[PDB]
Design a protein around this nucleic acid. Structure first.
Lengths: 98, 67, 197, 52
RNA sequence: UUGACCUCAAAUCAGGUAGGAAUACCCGCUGAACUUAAGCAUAUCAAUAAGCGGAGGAAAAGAAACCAACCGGGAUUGCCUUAGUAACGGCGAGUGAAGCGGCAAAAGCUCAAAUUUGAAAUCUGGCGUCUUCGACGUCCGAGUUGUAAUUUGAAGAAGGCAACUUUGUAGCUGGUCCUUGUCUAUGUUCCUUGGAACAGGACGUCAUAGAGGGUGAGAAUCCCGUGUGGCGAGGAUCCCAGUUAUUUGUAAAGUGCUUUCGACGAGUCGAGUUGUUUGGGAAUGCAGCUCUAAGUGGGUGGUAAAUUCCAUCUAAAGC
């Protein structure tokens, strides 16, 4: 909803608005029921990478923060280190425990 | 292209035409169009339609009959 | 090199410019080629118009939002609203654009009227036998022009209420500058430190 | 080739000169001075019927 | 002992295909200096000349991992504007785009990733027969480590309920478009000058033909033509029109409602660093090297980061 003036927060002209119905191409990045099943099988076959085998050793010793700094150098950016280190904790809670 | 299975079948017929002689050399392959830098965007201005083509356009004096 | 009291010019002629000169002598002759091409195409096609029927569209930016202009294609929502399929519409002389969207009820109606006006006025010949020909109209833009929407009432009441239009702009502009820090000042004092209390 | 051949002229300036030339069609002094054997002709601003 | 399969060979085996030429324009690689800065080293000339590879009558580009911040536009290409502007630069000399706006022209689409699985449905060659740029039948081979039908994000599929509107393949004549051949007006009358009238003077004729050329000197009317319109011949043929065979059909397409799903491209994206290039400035694109992902994910939003939102498209295959 616009405010009815050229300068402001909303800005500007008021119209009968809604709606565009959603396209098919907006979904794109959404999951499964093949893909999660196939990715589950392609994990037991076979193992983790060498840099990932340091991550779980680093979590047992020096927890977080150091785990991010090692992952940030090996992977691209800080935002990708968030995803990897959060995922590696879910491996320990799932596989090693219970 | 000379083999008759490729000539008759309509899905793979286009490659037999004379315009597709040495695509690899001129850079009409997947890797070729990446190396030339042909993509839609503000990042790709100096090369997009053609690097030398664009230079040849904008380094030229266009004169009409009535100036 | 310089010196009287003249303006400092900028002439970019230090490359081999004379090798890459163009003179448009062909202007007059090239016009006849296009008039010949437009005429010869109409002879081949025969009873149909040369142009596809285009929709009405509003322009972008602050500079041009106050004017309407002929777009590219009719969208999929508007073609459905009239009562026809998108695949069928392409062979009747109606342009379709799969990527344009609708977020306005005013433009939505206008183009539905434009399609209903088009479908009524055109005739269609069957595939089989008889074909009662009715000359050719060349330009679709001539028969279906673009008119500017009128948002006007020439004589009108004078309703004042001591608000001041100038004072409204100064207050509204000040809110945009300061809502960032005013949210954060409210997130301290009243929240965080006093939600602890 | 790229020397200036054609010359642009103002639209009103052409119509000024073309209008004055149509004024020059009448008036017998300017016609005889600019050639033309027009001794026989009864008057000028010469109009003919539409059978022509 | 015999026969398969997988990789690799040989033959003047059966049948095909590649080179050179020309290069005005077009697609890439490679790459100078004279010069300008009143010197000269970054810069400039120039992402230019010479050198090398590859095409066609055009080439390239092209159906958004786009432009925007509006009440939003909507593949590519070119012209007029934007602009000598925003930026770049011993911030010196000098260099220098793009969005919107008005026009010319407008056309859209295909694979991979799903099981035909109640019938590899598909295709090359051999031999035979026909109406021979092909069609029909038959015999080996290719191929299940995947050839047909079916679907491409604008969607779409599998079920249930429901009304149905559509259809197709040859040759014959005529027009149309090219290459052409032929036909279609009027003074050579009299006198002077001259080697010669095509000159000068007198009297006519034709004109939808007084363009141009030829003939012993400036010829509409002496000759070829020119103008106006006829009449043939020989190709191209699907572009149209009008016909005649056929004979496609119980198969192919479209649409209203409702439930469950909805597969989307990796030594890539992205990060660091070196060299090169751009107007692109804590780095515009390209390339080498080291590191190396993801599933509401990834890209972009022209100042480096961390934190939280929003708007926009769907890359790493192709016409």
């Amino acid at each position: 909803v616009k405010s009815g003036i050229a300068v402001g927060l909303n800005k500007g002209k008021k119209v009968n608005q809604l709606t565009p119905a959603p396209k098919i191409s907006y979904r794109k990045g959404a999951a499964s029921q093949r893909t999660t099943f196939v990715r589950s099988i392609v994990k037991e076959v076979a193992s983790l990478a060498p840099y990932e085998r340091r991550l779980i050793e680093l979590i047992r010793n020096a927890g977080e923060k150091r785990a991010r700094k090692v992952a940030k150098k090996r992977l691209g950016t800080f935002g990708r280190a968030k995803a990897k280190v959060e995922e590696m904790n879910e491996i320990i809670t799932a596989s090693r425990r219970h | 292209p000379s083999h008759k299975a490729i000539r008759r079948d309509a899905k793979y017929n286009w490659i037999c035409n004379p315009v597709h002689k040495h695509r690899e050399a001129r850079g009409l392959t997947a890797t070729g169009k990446k190396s030339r830098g042909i993509n839609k965007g503000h990042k790709f201005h100096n090369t997009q339609a053609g690097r030398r083509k664009t230079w040849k356009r904008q380094n030229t004096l266009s004169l009409w009959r009535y100036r | 090199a310089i010196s009287k009291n003249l303006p400092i010019l900028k002439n970019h002629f230090r490359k081999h410019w004379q090798e890459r000169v163009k003179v448009h002598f062909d202007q007059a002759g090239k016009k006849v080629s296009r008039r010949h091409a437009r005429a010869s195409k109409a002879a081949k096609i025969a009873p149909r118009p040369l142009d596809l029927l285009r929709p009405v569209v509003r322009a972008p930016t602050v500079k041009y939002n106050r004017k309407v202009r002929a777009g590219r294609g009719f969208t999929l929502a508007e073609i459905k609203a009239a009562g026809l399929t998108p695949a069928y519409a392409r062979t009747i002389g109606i342009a379709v654009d799969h990527r344009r969207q609708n977020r306005n009820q005013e433009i939505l109606d206008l183009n539905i009227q434009r399609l209903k006006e088009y479908q009524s006025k055109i005739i269609v010949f069957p595939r089989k036998g008889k074909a009662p020909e009715a000359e050719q109209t060349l330009s679709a833009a001539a028969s279906f022009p673009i008119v500017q929407p009128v948002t006007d009432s020439e004589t009108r009441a004078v309703e004042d209420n001591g608000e001041s239009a100038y004072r409204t702009l100064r207050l509204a502009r000040s809110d945009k500058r300061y809502k960032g820090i005013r949210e954060k000042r409210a997130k301290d004092k009243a929240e965080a430190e006093a939600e602890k209390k | 080739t790229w020397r200036k051949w054609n010359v642009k002229v103002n639209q009103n300036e052409k119509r000024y000169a073309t209008a004055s030339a149509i004024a020059a069609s009448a008036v017998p002094s300017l016609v005889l001075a600019r050639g033309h054997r027009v001794e026989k002709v009864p008057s000028i601003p010469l109009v003919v019927s539409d059978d022509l």
